[PDB]
């Protein structure tokens, strides 16, 4: 029969997977039920690409653009967080070469053009952010990661001129009332931490009360967006294994991810600065490294890292 065969290698893809989960801390939670949830959700997912004898497919929405924040981030450009978390990807997927031969690839989504005036950075920063970013997968030979445009759909006529454009597009053919979102986001305690934690990385990127009710809306248009890239993305591969950098009930089809060690379950790359502490990498801010006794070090001019 070998189905037993079959659900050891697509255990073993899902047991590596759990450790890298990126969820929402808490002790009362029992995370043994948790996996067994999980388990059940992604499993089958897995297993369509195996009983196929084709690669395992992710699709990540990730690195959209920098924080315009100084004091939370180094620099426009993709620093050395970014290199490491590329890096920690694309080994992820060779990894899973060693169980299974034809591997495992990772379509990164661009989410920057999406939500680029909701969030304050020029649609021409944004895009050289693009750009870098695929340069650091060719700089650093990460094959199995892809990357997935907004202007690869079909349906947006190549407006790389007006991305406005092409804002209007996705929202029409693939948003929710923003209604319809304060909803949804209010029925289940992961709705809510969602929106707070939108509204207060918001918050953070300006640098009030007025200030907070801004992000308060601009997180409900925010999410608006992002959850019309999910579906333009949700159609376009709809096989494929979701990945997330946001922390996910374990109901979810979606999967959270992390991709550097950090003690914010939200911290992400582009949001942050790496840190060398005690010879390990770090995801930390980069005004709480400027307090600390952080040295930056600089490669190829730009600045990528911070030494303690
Ligand atoms: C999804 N998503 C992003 C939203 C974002 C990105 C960049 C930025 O400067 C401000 C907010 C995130 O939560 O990281």
Known sequence: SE??????????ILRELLQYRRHLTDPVKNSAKEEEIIKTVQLPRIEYFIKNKKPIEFILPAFPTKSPNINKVLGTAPDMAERLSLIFLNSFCQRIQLYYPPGARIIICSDGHVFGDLIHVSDEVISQYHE???????EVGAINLSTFNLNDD??????????????????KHYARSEASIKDELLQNNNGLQLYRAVTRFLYEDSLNNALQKDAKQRAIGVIQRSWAWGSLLDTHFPKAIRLSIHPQPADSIKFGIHMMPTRDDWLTPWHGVAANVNGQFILMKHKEVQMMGGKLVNIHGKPSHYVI
């Open 3 to 12: 189905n037993v065969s079959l659900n050891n290698i697509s255990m073993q």
């Open 154 to 171: 079909k349906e947006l006529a190549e407006h790389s001129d007006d991305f406005n454009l092409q804002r209007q597009m996705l929202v």
């Open 132 to 138: 870098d970013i695929k340069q650091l997968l060719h």
